[PDB]
Design a protein around this nucleic acid. Sequence first.
DNA 1: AGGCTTTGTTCTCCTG
DNA 2: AGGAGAACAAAGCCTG
Length: 76
Amino acid sequence: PHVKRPMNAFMVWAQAARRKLADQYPHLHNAELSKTLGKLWRLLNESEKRPFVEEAERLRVQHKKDHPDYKYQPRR
DNA sequence: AGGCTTTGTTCTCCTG
DNA sequence: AGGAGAACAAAGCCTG
């Protein structure tokens, strides 16, 4: 068994945004989508980012509670 | 199976 | 010393 990383603010926000974007732009692939998502992300300010920042932090805390002895060991 | 693409978090290396 | 560099979370498509 090999766990995986908790989502950060950007990833949490991109779940529902990618979706809405893919609707609007069916002809686009996730590569291109991601570029548009980037710009849309940095277009937000503190207040607009806060809920996802908070959401990434509770997700983060939960990950530690779920996996106490976890340690991130990326591959080479 | 793994690349393409993004941000943010966390890892593994270390020269002068 | 701390930071450059890269992995890896999400998505779904798509050759040989």
